[PDB]
């Protein structure tokens, strides 16, 4: 067996295994504890595994959230940092609420950070929102965009339906059968 | 140990042909495959003489030879869909040749291509070429201007074009060139700070009048 | 503008240069006398003043000239920058 | 008005405090040393030296960030009639 | 075997292997732990491997992100640094969102950092955005540019379709068969 | 055998081997660890190797980036030093993105550093950009300049197509066959 | 054998050997480690070697760059020093970019430092540039000056083709045959 990756985290290893199985590559996950997880494949599949790891840029990076740039640990905060942390927390709470709607599998949301200027001495601009979501197969997407827009409109003091962008997509085909082992 | 056994597990990807100069010719489809083959030979995994070839390289080499011995021949492209019987497209209007001269030309080409059994010479219509070009631009709804010369036609596409227009344009040009080659129609794509997209007018007492084309342009304030 | 910034900077720079030497010698004399009074235990407190007065006056005698040349050159410079515009 | 001045002066005060406590701690080894009278000789030189480094931003740090501007008239005044 | 490179990390080693395999060069990856990874090739292929390593400028460098120029540890932070960190986080969050769309394999995004001025005393300029993305084979690229533009437009307070540039490309052919071993 | 160079870096040695191989000079790379790499050649080739080393001015130097001139570890940052670091990070991030386009092997980019005056009390001047890039063989360069200009235009607040210079070139012939050994 | 020079650097030794060989003088390079390199020749060639060492003023002096006069490790900087470092890094980065164009071996660039004055109260003067380059044999120099000028013009806020001087030259004949040994 040839070593592809070592010292992976659990959430990275399961992502790599998922992507390789989709392309008919049988892979093995090994645990070394404090040294993390290792991924191995057979020689006939080594080349392909390398090319897919490059093409998808695996292993995945950790997820970024704006509150990481402005830790509360400091004794000081300008208005700008506090306002940034506030919006960075609303974004997360809206995503967690949308995941509870009927049929939605995952979603992601973005808000206009008008705080990139202080709005000092100046009138504050209107809010803009964008959302992405994935649905179960056989969902009437057209008739479901309305509900999302209606829900998001009232989460802020001033939002127009014109200023809300929504993009929906369906789940891909299920990978249920196991890949074949090299002869 | 045949050569095909050395090129890989996929077999149909390459095509091996014998030639009258007692040399093997490997026909490839693209640059990447060409290098995948060339590595085998240059490494010395094979003992006899061999060579790798593709359509673009041979088009170039043949054009270089034509430039010297037929410096006034008007022609389009040589197609190698069937590498044993190439097709050479000549202009009907721009060439005057006898049947005998055409036959001699055929034989000399056959001497340049020791892997081909014969060369078929076909006459094509320039109006057809130009028409298919213009129809492809109208079909994509790109803005353009046409200019004609005794030996060619130019289409100029210029201005503040949108991303979608750029994409569709570049796809079309890439497609057409593969069929007719560059020798007769040229497409020029040039971005400018100009929202009219190459149109121009003058305001007189009679209102607007369309300007002739030219180099200079009015950069938009708007 | 840059002439303004330059002239204002230079003012502080000259203060620093001129005042620096007297304050150095008054420091060194303060440290030496304070140490001496621990090396032999004597609890006087005017002795520093008595010595450092002579110390400062001596270097005012020494530098009396360079003080006037620097200030003249600076005054002429800033009068030019103020008035010579065209 | 008070806040902006303290925020701006803070860098010179801290260094002048640390310079004095450093001489205080030094005096523990030589209790006849008049650390106060020494600090009086030092502090005006230190104050000018330090103010001379952070001097150039004093141009922009006032010309814009503190100047009043006409858009502010909306909030400081209203019409009562 | 001849030594090409030593002391690689994991993500450099796998990129070098991928690029050599593409050109029919069989390579070997060895792990020395604290000494990193080593890559070796046969003599008949040494010359070619050297030429490609030069041409592609391998091994790759690490990714650059603007937040590396403005550590939050500094005792003083101008507005300029805070605003820079903010934008440099938004860029990364958008990239990570685009990778969730249907068919997109990877992408990159750029924002106009007007933070190169404070806009102190001046009315603030409009935002400009650029995106690059790679798609699965058989995707109607022309029809998919619209989705990207729509989604990006509402993520900022003021953006015009005119100010958004989008460039798309397809995945290259898959490298599945293994290279031949030197005779 | 005669010693040409000693105490080289890895990246600095592989370039020398590449340049000598191109001219039919067989060279050897030796590792002494803490003493680095050494390069050796046969006597019949010594004269030529000396002439080429001079002509190309080998070994190559380290690459320069403006951020190296204004280290972030300073006690204080003037607005000049902050602004310079910012631009010198955007340049690198753009180069790394251009290398991801289809067919581009390598590229370089330059921006007009207007910061050589603060623009304090001055109306700030427009930005100018230049780029160089190397392409795979058989690329229609003329048709590909458009994409690059389009992509760069929107990465900045104010850029005109007139102010962007782009120069493209193709890859040289591949060096695949090994040089002959002296008799 | 007579000693010509002792305690050389590697880069000084190879330049001396190159110039002696060009005039048909066989020389020997010896390594003493911490004491550096020594160069020796035969008596029949001693006189000539002396005359050429005088004529070329060997060994070469180290390369000069303006940043060396204003080390960044200072605890104070005037505006003038910062501005100088800036320009002294742009010059180097441009020379390093030009060496990547097609068939350029080496190049040099110079920029007009206005930094020797503040241009105080005056509209600051426009920039001027100069460049030198060495091409491979058979290069159409006339057609290549245009590209260079075009590339340089957009690297700065205000440059006119009239203010750019470019001087090009071809490489000399190759020194391939070895010198004859004294009888
Ligand atoms: C307690 C003395 C304070 C003196 C402050 C002024 C110092 C400059 C005196 C003038 C120049 C020196 N001198 C000897 C001519 O007096
Ligand atoms: C308090 C600053 C130092 C004391 C000097 C003040 C300037 C006095 C006038 C200088 C005149 C010079 N002089 C005699 C050559 O003309």
From Swiss-Prot, chains A, E, F, G:
Shown residues within the full chain: 20 to 202 of 252
Family membership noted in the UniProt record: Belongs to the YscJ lipoprotein family.
Protein name: Lipoprotein PrgK
Keyword terms: Cell outer membrane, Lipoprotein, Membrane, Palmitate, Protein transport, Signal, Transmembrane, Transmembrane helix, Transport, Virulence
GO biological process: protein secretion
Protein topology in the membrane: Lipid-anchor
Function: Required for invasion of epithelial cells. Could be involved in protein secretion.
GO CC, alphabetical: cell outer membrane
Gene designation: prgK
Domain of life: Bacteria
Localization per record: Cell outer membrane
From Swiss-Prot, chain B:
Keyword terms, alphabetized: Cell membrane, Membrane, Transmembrane, Transmembrane helix, Virulence
Gene Ontology terms: cellular component: plasma membrane
Lineage: Bacteria, Pseudomonadati, Pseudomonadota, Gammaproteobacteria, Enterobacterales
Signal peptide: none
Superkingdom of origin organism: Bacteria
Localization: Cell membrane
Record's function text: Required for invasion of epithelial cells.
The protein's name in its UniProt record: Protein PrgH
Shown part of the complete sequence: 171 to 392 of 392
Membrane topology: Single-pass membrane protein
Curated annotation (Swiss-Prot), chain C:
Keywords for this protein: Cell membrane, Membrane, Transmembrane, Transmembrane helix, Virulence
Main location: membrane
GO biological process assignments: bacterial-type flagellum assembly; protein secretion
GO-annotated cellular components: plasma membrane
Location in the cell: Cell membrane
InterPro entries in UniProt: Bac_export_3, T3SS_HrpO
TM region(s), chain numbering: 16-36, 53-73
Annotated membrane topology: Multi-pass membrane protein
Function: Involved in a secretory pathway responsible for the surface presentation of determinants needed for the entry of Salmonella species into mammalian cells.
Family: Belongs to the FliQ/MopD/SpaQ family.
Protein name per the record: Surface presentation of antigens protein SpaQ
Gene that this polypeptide is encoded by: spaQ
Swiss-Prot record, chain D:
Transmembrane segments: 6-26, 35-55
Keyword Cell membrane: yes
Location(s), subcellular: Cell membrane
Main localization, broad class: membrane
Any single biological process term in GO: protein targeting
Gene Ontology cellular component list: plasma membrane
Keyword Membrane carried by entry: yes
The entry's keywords: Cell membrane, Membrane, Transmembrane, Transmembrane helix, Virulence
Its job: Involved in a secretory pathway responsible for the surface presentation of determinants needed for the entry of Salmonella species into mammalian cells.
Family of the protein in this entry: Belongs to the FliR/MopE/SpaR family.
Protein name: Surface presentation of antigens protein SpaR
Organism for this UniProt entry: Salmonella typhimurium (strain LT2 / SGSC1412 / ATCC 700720)
Section covered of the full-length record: 177 to 257 of 263
């Amino acid at each position: 067996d040839k070593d592809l990756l070592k010292g992976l985290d659990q959430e990275q290893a399961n992502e790599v295994i998922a992507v390789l199985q989709m392309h008919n590559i049988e892979a093995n996950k090994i645990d070394s504890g404090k040294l993390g997880y290792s991924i191995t494949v057979a020689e006939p599949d080594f080349t392909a595994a390398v090319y897919w790891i490059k093409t998808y840029q695996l292993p995945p990076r950790p997820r970024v959230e704006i509150a990481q740039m402005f830790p509360a640990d400091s004794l000081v905060s300008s208005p700008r940092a506090e306002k940034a942390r506030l919006y960075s927390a609303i974004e997360q709470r809206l995503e967690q609420s949308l995941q509870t709607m009927e049929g939605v599998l995952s979603a992601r949301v973005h808000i206009s950070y008008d705080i990139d200027a202080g709005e000092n001495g100046r009138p504050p601009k209107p809010v803009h929102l964008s959302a992405l979501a994935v649905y179960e197969r056989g969902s009437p997407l057209a008739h479901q965009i309305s509900d999302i827009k209606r829900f998001l409109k009232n989460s802020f003091a001033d939002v127009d339906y014109d200023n809300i962008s929504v993009v929906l997509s369906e789940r891909s085909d299920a990978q249920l059968q196991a890949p074949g082992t090299p002869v | 140990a045949e050569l095909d056994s050395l090129l890989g597990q996929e077999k149909e990807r390459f095509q091996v042909l014998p030639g009258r100069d007692k040399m093997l010719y490997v026909a490839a489809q693209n640059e990447r495959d060409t290098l995948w083959a060339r590595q085998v030979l240059a490494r010395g995994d094979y003992d006899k003489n061999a060579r790798v070839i593709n359509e673009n390289e041979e088009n170039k080499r043949i054009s270089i030879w034509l430039d010297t011995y037929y410096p006034q021949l008007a022609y389009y492209r040589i197609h190698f869909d069937e590498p044993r019987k190439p097709v050479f497209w000549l202009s009907r209007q721009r060439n005057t040749m006898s049947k005998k001269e055409l036959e001699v030309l055929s034989q000399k080409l056959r001497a340049l291509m020791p892997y081909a059994d014969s060369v078929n010479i076909t006459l094509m219509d320039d109006v057809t070429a130009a028409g298919q070009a213009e129809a492809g631009l109208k079909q994509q709804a790109l803005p353009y201007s046409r200019r004609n010369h005794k030996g060619g036609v130019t289409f100029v596409i210029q201005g503040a074009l949108d991303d979608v227009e750029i994409l569709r344009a570049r796809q079309f040009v890439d497609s057409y060139y593969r069929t007719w080659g560059g020798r007769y129609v040229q497409f020029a794509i040039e971005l400018k700070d100009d929202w009219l997209k190459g149109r121009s007018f003058q305001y007189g007492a009679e209102g607007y009048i369309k300007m002739s084309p030219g180099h200079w342009y009015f950069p938009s304030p708007l | 503008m840059d002439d303004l910034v330059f002239a204002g900077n230079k003012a502080l720079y000259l203060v620093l240069i001129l005042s620096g030497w007297p304050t150095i010698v008054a420091t060194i004399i303060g440290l030496l006398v304070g140490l001496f009074q621990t090396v032999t235990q004597l609890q006087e407190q005017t002795l520093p003043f008595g010595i450092k007065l002579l110390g400062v006056c001596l270097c005012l005698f020494l530098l009396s000239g360079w003080y006037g040349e620097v200030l003249l050159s600076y005054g002429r410079q800033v009068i030019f920058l103020a008035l010579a515009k065209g | 008005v008070a806040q902006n001045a303290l925020v701006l002066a803070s860098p010179v005060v801290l260094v002048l405090l640390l310079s004095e406590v450093f001489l205080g701690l030094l005096s523990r080894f030589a209790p006849q040393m008049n650390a106060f009278a020494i600090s009086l000789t030092v502090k005006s030189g230190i104050a000018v030296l330090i103010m001379l480094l952070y001097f150039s931003p004093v141009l922009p740090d006032n010309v814009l960030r503190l100047s009043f501007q006409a858009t502010g008239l909306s909030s400081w005044f209203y019409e009562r009639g």
